[PDB]
Ligand binder design. Structure first.
Ligand code: NA
Ligand code: NA
Ligand code: NA
Ligand code: NA
Lengths: 295, 295, 295, 295
């Protein structure tokens, strides 16, 4: 046998960082979960019990905290690039570092209509994520995303005109509920290294904001012909607004809300135009994906 | 042997309801998860395979949907009282109905600074709950709560002066992070039946709002001596602002954020006043509870 | 306002212990999650920021580990009684200790038909639990349980003869799938203190084994008239076999498996006696409970 | 813009199937969760609201149940190949089907030492999985796996000799706990179509059994130099025992169990050779991966 691929490191590293403005008293907090996986000339740790090539995963953990102490942790695209670059430069035999960061929300509280200097609320489990691949000789590849954005519209979704054959029982509809959990990813042009990532730092938060804005507005305003058609509209606009993005990926479940026929009970009318009470379905769910790039 | 207690019913009943304003086009959605458990003269279903006393749990499910079709589902205190009252009045041998409702957030979206008529976002997993116990001959007992409200303050928490003996290693501190997931419950005076619950309908949403407001403001503004002292302040104010509440209960985890000593690395200073990077601890956690009532 | 009830402590304390037999080389492992909550003359920590009455929850944590170091952690009824007794005896102002223990499975591996001296597998998420309430002047109250025991029978469950009215749509059946997750609790006679708990130590593992055995055999062999009737049979036998148990509680979900009518497709017959493919339902679910005691 | 990739279908489809032996009364049950995602000439559903190219995901659901009714659901490699082949043959414009199946355990109960004909227990959350990619013109690519296999050894794990620099604090050890959740995948040689998959049907269950056996025995018997070295041993043996496998992948977390220094308390000795009580760490965790193929 032979090792064909190998990577190893530390997962689920929870990190908090606070910034304290000494002049204003305003504090700002950041919280993330980090994974770093290394690749390189490490195959002998697998085949020959040669631990000399292993940067201990506990040391990877230490390095995450030390890097957060010495560097900004925002935007996460930059933090991840700094972290990944560290491993490939520090260790001659480590040739790639794969950095995944999940950013958790801590939104400043408004108390009596005024922003509080040190109190925060988690307004949802929506995450902002990055996957940063730092590869010696091949620059830095960054995928940015939002996930866990849960939305519902109560009308202005339709689904008709689909293929009908002997496997088909679904009725066409011209008015249904549409609910999903948005997973949206934008893939940046390859960067040649940390300097180039730094040169674009303002674009990371601005593109996250654009993606979020475009997602919500397109979902709210498109009288949707299908999940497929709505998500493509989202992706085309994000590409039109940031030319340093090469592709946009969406992965969207269709979380079904079924009508409930109550006509067996006292002739109760609860379908079609009279539909008021629905049964949300936990499973199964449609799953719709696409990757859109530039023509 | 003998049956000492017995209750049965349907759990995890997901329910959605939409209201459509025909004049304005504005739609409003509600989503909940409901459990109804019945008690009564049902012991022979257990001891003698006498299913004649069983209102099938599938029929309990049907009844939840039918009740939601015919009645408002908000505030949940009212919906639960209507539902529970139905079972004890409909069925001579059913003497208590226990109704648990978890309300899920669907907050109207703001698109370009304007509220959207039919699009909603789940801004957090925070829940609004009720437990309604409808007992023949004993009225309706309602416990209202909020849960899953996750908060953090980055300073203005302290913990010193606690008992110190041979089991103690914790250092006193005058400045620490405090983070918790708030579970707060207010217990109403017994209501004599559905009419009395209806007579107080506006107080249910207003008291939920007060509890939420008081929780957030007290957490943000109290320079906390302990979780115990902060939560008692919250409970006293809620009791002062709604005299139809008899008790307030809080259950608060202390989700620890540990300092990380980095001085072993190049003399890095990351403790005490220099503490910037912390390690959030998934477990264990302090757990602090109290029930406060009127003197 | 006034404090009506208060308890506090440390939750989610994960504990592992190993026993090493020096002569045979055989090692045995135990893993649990522990919660200890204390009550007593602690109200001033809530009302007057008097932390002097607080045994720090970090010290409660230390005490759990120290107690596990110095004492057997099996059976958990004993460990919990030792732990709870410690707090009420050590601290004059602490008058009750509430100890919850969840025991995780580590079953010795069989390698080539022979038991391995130090290798273990988690054969399921089934738990063995205890709730031990140590109350000064009132002895030690122990509730023992098993939970997470997931079972299915593919026939020899029936459900007919239930109440039928205008809310009823369920069809009677004489042959259905029955699947549940068993939560079974046995409540011991009050013990006067640790000596009495110690005097009964062999009965704790033996009664857990009986409960488990009786549950599985009754589920497998009863041609069930209803969940209610089957669970009552289980509880009566456990009471008959351990006279130091005062009550037995079961809480059983009915995890439904729905038939799928495929006759719309090429006249496929998949219902009734031809039922082969089913759709397991994640929600809703029946929930059936009872507490059985001695006549 | 342009669609670069697109796939869509139905996820989280829960399926149960029973086989009833008419002669012996013995019933056997199977339960899985299925995802089917289709690719093909479907881009106009995204770009032009052309739903005519969409095989509705509800119809994909129907097709899963119909296929389970008409075909064996075991081994899952075969079921998945039948299912995927159906879509690419039935629909001219569908050119790939991606089938993921998670198989849930239902192990026959032993009641009084004898196998029960229709009663089953879920002995763990360990899963058996397949990923089957049916691609027109390119055959059928199958990845088989086991996941969720949770194990612990209490000694005969070591970790020393690793790189030590200014980021390193971990102490070398010659005796530690090793615990992991095994995710192991074996990748079959490409099959030219369903006939070739059928020709190998006995090898699917036998190779799953070998992988499981080899994993457990290697974990139990290797005095492990590192997770890397132990997992490579597992993968080499599986490749040696099934020549129709091209690669083996392992993904193994190192779930840490930390020693607890109790010497601050009455000189208690709980480290090194005296280590008896440990604190299992929920996070972070090492994560070690490798893909092994043939030299
Ligand atoms: Na390098
Ligand atoms: Na009644
Ligand atoms: Na005491
Ligand atoms: Na095709």
């Amino acid at each position: 046998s032979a090792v064909k691929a190998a990577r190893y490191g530390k997962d689920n590293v929870r990190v908090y960082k606070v910034h304290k403005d000494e002049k204003t008293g305003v504090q700002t907090v950041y919280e993330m979960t980090v994974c770093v996986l290394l690749e390189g000339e490490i195959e002998t740790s697998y085949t020959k019990a040669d631990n000399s090539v292993i940067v201990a995963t506990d040391s990877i953990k230490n390095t995450i905290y030390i890097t957060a102490k010495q560097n900004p942790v925002t935007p996460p695209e930059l933090f991840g690039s700094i972290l990944g670059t560290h491993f490939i430069e520090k260790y001659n035999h480590i040739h790639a570092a794969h950095v995944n960061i999940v950013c958790h929300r801590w939104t400043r509280m408004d108390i009596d209509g005024k922003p509080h200097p040190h109190s925060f609320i988690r307004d949802s489990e929506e995450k902002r994520n990055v996957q940063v691949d730092v590869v010696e000789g091949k620059g830095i590849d960054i995928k940015s995303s939002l996930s866990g954005l849960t939305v519902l519209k109560s009308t202005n979704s339709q689904f008709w005109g689909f293929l009908r054959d002997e496997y088909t029982t679904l009725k066409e509809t011209w008015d249904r509920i549409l609910s999903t959990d948005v997973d949206a990813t934008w893939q940046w042009k390859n960067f040649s290294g940390l300097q180039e990532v730094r040169s674009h730092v303002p674009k990371f938060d601005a593109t996250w904001a654009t993606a979020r804005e475009v997602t919500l507005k397109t979902f709210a305003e498109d009288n949707s012909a299908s999940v497929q058609a709505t998500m493509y509209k989202m992706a085309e606009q994000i590409l039109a607004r940031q030319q340093l993005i090469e592709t946009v990926e969406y992965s969207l479940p269709n979380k079904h809300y079924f009508e409930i026929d109550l006509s067996w009970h006292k002739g109760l009318q609860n379908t079609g135009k009279n539909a008021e009470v629905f049964a949300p379905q936990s499973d199964p769910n449609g799953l719709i994906k696409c990757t859109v790039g530039r023509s």
